[PDB]
Amino acid sequence: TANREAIDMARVAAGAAAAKLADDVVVIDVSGQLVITDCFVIASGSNERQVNAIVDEVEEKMRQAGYRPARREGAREGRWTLLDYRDIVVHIQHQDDRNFAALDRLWGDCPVVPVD
């Protein structure tokens, strides 16, 4: 399964998104699929303000956890942001833009990490 250190990072990220009332907050164990990243963290906002508040909360809480800033990515015209912390990767998106079948297609065979 996923390394304990990676799960702890995921816990911090998911707790930050939950603190800003994100929807779809799930930690995916991708340790059996990928060679580097162990946890994928999904989160969604109902508006773009919230999406960005979730993004900033995750970064601020990850900094407090002692980690270096994520390598970031997003679409200039899109409403998503990708945060790469290596052991984990965080993906935050406006719920209206999400493709949920595509998510399940990609990670449907991966265990959910009950992180609470």
Added chain:
Amino acid sequence: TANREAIDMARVAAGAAAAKLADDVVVIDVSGQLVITDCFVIASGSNERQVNAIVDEVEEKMRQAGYRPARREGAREGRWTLLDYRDIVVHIQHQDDRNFAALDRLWGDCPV
């Protein structure tokens, strides 16, 4: 349009993939679309071991040209490997998995 520092990185990464006999090597300018990444370099290997060697070639010359180490990722079965250099992302894939349709609906308007 795409960065000088990125084009000269894509040049190196694509040439390296060329030196180790990759197929369907493409440099895609995504600078118009993305915030951070400026270019993608996609390539195919005929098999998992060729994908492995292609990655080696790319990483070897990128280090030689004094570039930052890649943030790597890969499928555990070696079907694909990705190297993130920030300014460019290199995507090497087993030709059987290369979906050119999905590429088109997504980086089709980008110069290639």
